[PDB]
Design a protein around this nucleic acid. Structure first.
Lengths: 136, 56, 78, 93, 143, 37, 100
RNA sequence: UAACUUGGGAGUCAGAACAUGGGUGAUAAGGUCCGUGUUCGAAAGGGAAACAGCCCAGACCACCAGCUAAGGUCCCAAAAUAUAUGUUAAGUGGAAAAGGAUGUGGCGUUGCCACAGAGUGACACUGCGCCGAAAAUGUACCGGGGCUAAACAUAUUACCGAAGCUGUGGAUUGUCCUUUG
């Protein structure tokens, strides 16, 4: 479960969620990558679910690189409460994925088995993906 | 004496900033016309209200 | 379910009080600040609250004092 | 294989650049020795073909200003979403 | 002032007959609604009916475009709880051919006291003959 | 006959066809018969 | 034989010996008037063109200069205490086309 | 073409929606609290089928005159069954996503020149459609009839259309005294 060991402020404003990604648009570590074509929030629990389903198809073949990390925390008020009377409490940690950012990277395998591994990892995420390679 | 500006669209539903530019050109009613000599100062005014007036 | 926040202080109107190239009197205030964001140039004093005021009449001009610093001066008319 | 290129004068508006990236052309600039940053245009599919022959670090016999100049590709911008280039730089030797 | 209006005295109505062999339902009903209303002549006079009598023979062989013989359903209620009936378009042409054509035209006329007297000038027959031979109806080509 | 919105071939023998505007999968084994995908 | 003349911003079809009502005229009662702008002459005579035919003026004698019946202009807004009533009598002039 | 100063008399301190930049809530509410515009409030008229807040436009009075705006031109219902060139078979238009698929066009890539003879495999990249898609009085998310063009794109010509504007008379106030006007 990815989460920072310490943060300065537990309660922060939600990210913008609109626009385009700043960096991480190319494949640098591995060979075959996984792009994103839709914007959404990727919870840390959805990362461990996709990482296990991916590295299992490759028993001991190669290495996987997680390129994102859940820095921003989100809050949620308890059940059966009216509006106001303060803010909520931390419930999880999210990231911001915009069209163009690589999510996972895989190396050490063949091209025919890299497509099947990155396919099972895309059904666990709430965004649409595209299989990409290293640029010439 | 070489430019004629007429008012086509109405000023209802327009920002107050653009209503002062039409008043500074001498266009009171709709479809009203004026004659002015071209210059950097008068040209920049109709460039602000381009979507409200047409120049011949 | 009470909170502990909600308190703030009154806003202190800081910043420039006179524009550039404007005629000022001999006791007008040019700048309110906390610290030294702008240094006192010639014909401009410095108050006990880091306020910048002018000593003489004339036009006020903002200049640059070296690298990453600036100052403000007052020159007499004509 | 040689880059048959044309020139564009004036200041190209934002619409014409979008219309240039759709007709199959790519803008480029030659800022070598004496060229004086001459803005130039080039085809898209004929650029991918020639760089495969000579390589990423090879010279090009580009024709700009109705004359031959030996230039190489210094750096280029790439849009990863639509797997195509958007701009080329030419550093003459 | 200076505009002419037609009253009950100066009105002349003619009898026409239309052939519906090989024509579309909606394309034919629209032009017949113009003949019944009276917008074909220069003495319109909206508050007075100046239309002409029209007769539509061969009510069968009315053509549809697309899957309309099956996917077009005619609904009607009967003011009773749960009572609702439905008849497809292909079945209506087989049992009651004239009703399919007569209702498509009456749906284009205005629903007023005068718009009801105009709809009574229509006579639709499934066969190729009409009984009203006493009058002299002239054939009419739709445009 | 399975009725699932995601109809896919299972083995090398099955085949995908279209009948009356619907994706069908007819296979030699009666087990791999799907519809409406 | 009729003619179409433009008199007071509108157009009227006239005939010999006819009583027409038009907008107010500066002529006196009992005098004569002459319409200069004729747009169309037809009927029994030969057809002519437009916008204005050559000559072919119309002469007519003035009969009476009076006012029409009075109307009452009343408007109001509901739940808003604001109503206003006016009156109006529009003047007119009657002529008789003696020669076309 | 307004601004500032002096004095007389006030009303107002419950605001609303819409577009947009943001807190709070659950990137819920016709929610709630701030910044910046518009309309309503205090605004008639035309359009959105009916609909204070959305689009067009600000009613001094009279007329059986003319020209346009937003929206429109088969019938209801005023004006093209207008012209050229393509797409779509679902009644899509005229309700919904992950996902699935030899539906059908347009521009490309590339290896065998066979797969069972002139054709043939596998991908990238886009246009428009299909499945996923079940609610309670009655068809019932086109306003109705009805429509494979009267649908959707694209490039040109006409016309309809408001209390807007012009035309022709008339009633007031104000301002130039070009004309006791």
């Amino acid at each position: 479960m990815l989460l920072p060991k310490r943060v300065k402020y537990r309660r922060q404003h939600r990210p913008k969620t609109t626009g385009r990604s700043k960096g991480g648009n190319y494949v640098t570590f591995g060979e075959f990558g996984l792009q994103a074509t839709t914007t959404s929030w990727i919870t840390s629990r959805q990362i461990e679910s996709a990482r296990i389903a991916m590295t299992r198809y490759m028993k001991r073949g190669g290495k996987v690189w997680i390129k994102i990390f859940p820095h921003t925390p989100y809050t949620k008020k308890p059940l059966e409460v009216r509006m106001g009377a303060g803010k909520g409490a931390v419930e999880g940690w999210i990231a911001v994925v915009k069209p163009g950012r690589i999510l996972f990277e895989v190396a050490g395998v063949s091209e025919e088995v890299a497509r099947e591994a990155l396919r099972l990892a895309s059904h666990k995420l709430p965004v649409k993906t595209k299989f990409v390679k290293r640029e010439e | 004496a070489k430019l004629q500006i007429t008012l086509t669209r109405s000023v209802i539903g327009r920002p107050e900033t653009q209503r002062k530019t039409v008043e500074a050109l001498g266009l009171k009613k709709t479809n009203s016309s004026v004659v002015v000599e071209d210059n950097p100062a008068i040209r920049g005014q109709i460039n602000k209200v381009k979507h409200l007036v047409t120049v011949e | 379910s009470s909170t502990k926040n909600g308190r703030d202080s009154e806003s202190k109107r800081l910043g420039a009080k006179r524009a550039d190239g404007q005629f000022v009197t001999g006791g007008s205030i040019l700048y309110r600040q906390r610290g030294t964001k702008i240094y006192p140039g010639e014909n401009v004093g410095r108050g006990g609250d880091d306020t910048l005021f002018a000593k003489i009449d004339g036009v006020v001009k903002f200049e640059r004092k070296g690298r990453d610093k600036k100052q403000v001066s007052v020159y007499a008319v004509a | 294989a040689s880059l048959k290129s044309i020139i564009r004068q004036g200041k190209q508006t934002r619409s014409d650049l979008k219309q240039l990236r759709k007709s199959g052309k790519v803008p480029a600039v030659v800022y070598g020795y004496g060229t004086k940053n001459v803005s130039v245009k080039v085809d898209e599919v004929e650029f991918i073909k020639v760089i495969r022959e000579v390589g990423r670090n090879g010279v090009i016999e580009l024709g700009v200003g109705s004359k031959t100049i030996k230039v190489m590709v210094a750096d280029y911008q790439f849009d990863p979403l639509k797997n195509q280039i958007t701009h080329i730089d030419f550093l003459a030797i | 002032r200076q505009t002419f209006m037609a009253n009950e005295s100066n009105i002349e109505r003619k009898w026409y007959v239309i052939d519906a062999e090989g024509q579309t339902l909606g394309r034919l009903s629209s032009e017949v609604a113009s003949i019944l209303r009276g917008k074909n002549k220069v003495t319109y006079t909206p508050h007075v009916d100046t239309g002409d009598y029209v007769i539509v023979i061969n009510a069968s062989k009315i053509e549809f475009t697309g899957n309309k013989e099956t996917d077009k359903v005619y609904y009607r209620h009967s003011n009773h709880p749960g009572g609702i009936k439905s008849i497809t378009a292909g079945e209506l042409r087989r049992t009651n051919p004239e009703r399919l054509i007569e209702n498509s035209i009456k749906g284009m006329l205005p629903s007023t006291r005068l718009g009801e007297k105009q709809g009574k000038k229509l006579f639709v027959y499934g066969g190729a003959e009409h009984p009203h031979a006493a009058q002299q109806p002239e054939n009419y080509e739709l445009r | 006959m399975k009725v699932r919105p995601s109809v896919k071939p299972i083995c090398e023998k099955c085949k995908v066809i279209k009948r009356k505007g619907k994706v069908m999968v007819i296979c030699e084994n009666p087990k791999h018969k799907q519809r409406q995908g | 034989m009729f003619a179409i003349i433009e008199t007071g911003g509108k157009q009227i079809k006239v005939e010999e010996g006819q009583e027409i009502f038009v907008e107010k005229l500066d002529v006196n009662e009992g005098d004569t008037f002459t319409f200069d702008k004729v747009l169309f002459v037809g009927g029994d005579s030969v057809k002519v063109g437009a916008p204005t035919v050559e000559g072919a003026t119309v002469t007519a004698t003035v009969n009476k200069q009076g006012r029409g019946k009075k109307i009452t202009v009343f408007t109001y807004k509901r739940r808003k205490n604001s109503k206003r009533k006016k009156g109006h009598r529009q003047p007119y002039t009657k002529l008789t086309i003696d020669k076309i």
